[PDB]
């Protein structure tokens, strides 16, 4: 049980709960995970699954976002939307609760990744508790392009659930008790005083 401050590199790849406040909700985007293709002459429906550092809890070789357009036999392929599978994808930046941040320090924050039915569980400003797996991703400047290797690895929480902390009725239900007492009260004269003074 953590917050974006006390979430620490010792916790990487462990299952964590973070108490915080939502900021910078990204737009929802559809993320391709399976592409389905009718083969023009072959008749078969070929397909391809896709991988990245967010779609899987464990590392697997990334599949780089390309639709295949030719069979092994060279026959051309027509991509099938609807049969192809896309998941909703969204990023939210959970900020530390400013009440918890100690003297003279800014609040830390981290990016939660949310897929499909966890998307838009919250909006900016919502106090929230998220549970997910804390992860590293990317090359962290170990790739030979980066002369500067003091930069740290990117890190995330891959979300497994999003609990909005609304508590520490917009249209009410009405029972026969309510119907009776509303009408019985309405026949009294001082309702304009009693209700307003309530």
């Amino acid at each position: 049980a953590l917050s974006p401050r006390t979430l620490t590199a010792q916790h990487l790849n462990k299952l964590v709960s973070v108490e915080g406040i939502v900021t910078k909700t990204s737009l929802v985007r559809p993320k391709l995970i399976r592409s389905v293709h009718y083969a023009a002459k072959t008749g078969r429906f070929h397909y391809r699954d896709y991988t990245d550092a967010t779609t899987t809890l464990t590392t697997r070789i990334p599949t780089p976002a390309i639709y295949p357009t030719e069979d092994t036999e060279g026959n051309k392929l027509t991509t099938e939307y609807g049969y192809s599978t896309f998941i909703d994808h969204q990023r939210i930046t959970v900020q530390e609760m400013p009440e918890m941040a100690p003297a003279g320090q800014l609040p830390r924050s981290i990016d939660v990744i949310l897929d499909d039915d966890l998307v838009d569980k919250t909006k900016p400003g919502d106090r929230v508790n998220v549970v997910g797996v804390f992860k590293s991703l990317g090359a962290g400047g170990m790739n030979q392009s980066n002369s500067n290797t003091l930069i740290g690895f990117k890190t995330l929480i891959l979300g497994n659930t999003v609990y909005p902390l609304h508590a520490r009725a917009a249209r009410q239900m009405l029972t026969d008790f309510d119907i009776r007492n509303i009408n019985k009260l309405s026949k009294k004269k001082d309702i304009f005083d009693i209700l307003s003074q309530s």
Binding site: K41, T42, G43, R44, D49, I61, T72, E73
Partner: protein, 320 residues
């Protein structure tokens, strides 16, 4: 004097033959837009012919007798038949020939491989009668197919039920049969699956109970062999104890989990002799190295980068 002939028609530009024992006709499917020996094959007879191997030729649409394999009656005693990537052939017509004639006294081996996905072919067990006051036509499937040691049907759109019916009818003997290839067949599903028409199910328990002493299996490219479906093979290990050589390569679904539990259960039989999982994306490196370290397979192949299966001359006679 010519007993063995091999025509390899790499390119295109524009009577009784008792001597002949083996005919190979390999044709570049891109270039050879005809069937070179068609008139000879349909007219002549080649009675000594032990082996025939025809690949890449395009069966002409204009002659339905060619499409119905009527020529193929001309070759009795045909110990081996290999026929592959001949674009306009069909297993559908082939099984009509197997239905309506005692075309062969003995095939030791059959290898039929159409390329495109033709419509679903089912074993046509319909036995009509000319009249109710007359006998039915004898269906010659058994006496044709009884002898097979090797059955290869890779890619042929055969439905799983058709193969079970070959086993339940015992058209395939089961004792004589010792090696089986049904890779790349999309119309094969396994009893653990939930999303199918029932006639595409291959009851592996019924089949493995029928043909139990087979040595070699090939299910390569069979995407339908997901990890859940592999559980059928796990529980059916007692009915396949003769298996030495297994090919399930170029499967982009089968995780190393199924490999390990299959081999652990197989080891309850003394390791498996040979396993091919080249090109499989989900066979984890640590798992296969544990397979080697525990010596659960005597040889296991894991060339992840090997894109293709059709080793020419070894695995396929479709040209290049």
């Amino acid at each position: 004097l010519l007993k063995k002939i091999e025509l390899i028609f790499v390119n295109s530009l524009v009577v009784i033959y008792s001597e002949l024992e083996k005919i190979t006709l390999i044709c570049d499917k891109k270039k050879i837009k005809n069937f070179p020996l068609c008139r000879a094959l349909l007219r002549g007879q080649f009675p000594l012919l032990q082996k025939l191997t025809i690949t890449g030729v395009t069966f002409p649409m204009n002659n339905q007798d060619i499409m119905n394999f009527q020529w193929l009656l001309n070759f009795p005693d045909l110990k081996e038949l290999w026929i592959e990537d001949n674009d306009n052939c069909e297993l559908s017509k082939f099984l009509q020939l197997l239905k309506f004639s005692n075309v062969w006294k003995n095939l030791e081996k059959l290898t039929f491989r159409e390329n495109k996905l033709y419509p679903i072919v089912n074993l046509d067990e319909d036995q009509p009668v000319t009249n109710d006051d007359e006998v039915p036509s004898m269906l010659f499937y058994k006496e044709n197919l009884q002898n097979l040691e090797k059955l290869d049907l890779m890619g042929t759109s055969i439905s799983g039920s058709a193969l079970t019916r070959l086993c339940e009818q015992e058209y395939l003997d089961g004792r004589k049969l010792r090696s089986l290839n049904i890779g790349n067949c999309p119309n094969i599903q396994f009893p653990n699956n939930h999303a199918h028409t029932a006639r595409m199910i291959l009851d592996v328990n019924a089949v493995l109970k029928r043909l139990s002493k087979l040595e070699e299996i090939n299910l390569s490219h069979l995407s339908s062999l997901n990890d859940s479906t592999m559980k059928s093979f796990i529980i059916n290990v007692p009915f396949l104890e003769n298996l030495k050589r297994l090919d399930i390569s170029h499967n982009f679904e089968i995780t190393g989990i199924s490999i390990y539990e299959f081999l652990k259960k197989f080891q309850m039989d003394q390791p498996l002799a040979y396993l091919n999982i080249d090109g499989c994306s989900q066979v984890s490196h640590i798992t296969v190295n544990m397979i080697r370290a525990q010596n659960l397979v005597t040889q296991v192949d894991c060339v992840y980068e090997r894109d293709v299966w059709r080793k020419f001359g070894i695995n396929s006679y479709s040209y290049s």
